[PDB]
Amino acid sequence: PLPGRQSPDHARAEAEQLAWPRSLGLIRSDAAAERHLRGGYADLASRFYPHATGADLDLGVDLMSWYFLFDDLFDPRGENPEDTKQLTDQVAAALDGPLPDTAPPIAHGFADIWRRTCEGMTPAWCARSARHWRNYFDGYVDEAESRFAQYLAMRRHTIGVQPTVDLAERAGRFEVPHRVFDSAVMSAMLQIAVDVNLLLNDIASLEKNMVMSHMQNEVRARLEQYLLLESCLPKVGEIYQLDTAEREALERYRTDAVRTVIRGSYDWH
């Protein structure tokens, strides 16, 4: 029950998507370039971030690019948590300061994304987004340990929905009021966005997992509850005493960050 939306700048973003990974050594062969283009990652970013154009959308394209280039590095290493952690620690180190020039290319790529994500956002927003990233990397180490219901406790972090939502704020150049982000209602909405994404992904990944199909009814129930939660937002805004600008940022967060992450993956698949 959410509108499909796509950035008006999607064609330029898709045409230029290869320049960034090539300049950071993430794509070094023409076959790897073609394999990247066939995934439709700029198209996906233009649906997660329909409110972004120009360099803001380019940042979202790079994040999608980096996401699938990074997940690729775990199709034997992904079997041993010690080797997984050796790589995630080098990427996660970019959240704490400059990387050594010897860091692998996938790490310099993340650092370039993170450097652009933070500029112009409040320090508290950056600290909060940084811990979402650490949750994501820690989840990769947790699932590798499971290789050497309780599936959600790990998949909710490794699906990478929260950093995607985080970037929608940065791409829109707004911040949801931090006390509303921490609210029980907003957390429930974000939990639905995460659950819906990994459910649709485990359905699409059946050919190549939660099926190990009440999932379709589970998505419908969560989307119905998501609308219930959306209708609580006016009262939530008063409980936290939001002024006009804060109420407008919360509305921007509802439509351009949470709704887009729920709808965008569906229209992509």
Ligand SMILES: C/C(=C\CC/C(C)=C/COP(=O)(O)OP(=O)(O)O)CCC=C(CF)CF
């Ligand atoms: C919400 C996001 C994308 C939409 C849902 C998608 C494609 C999630 C990707 O799930 P994965 O199991 O890691 O790989 P797969 O495509 O299933 O072989 C951004 C995060 C993308 C990742 C790609 F791996 C997360 F690591």
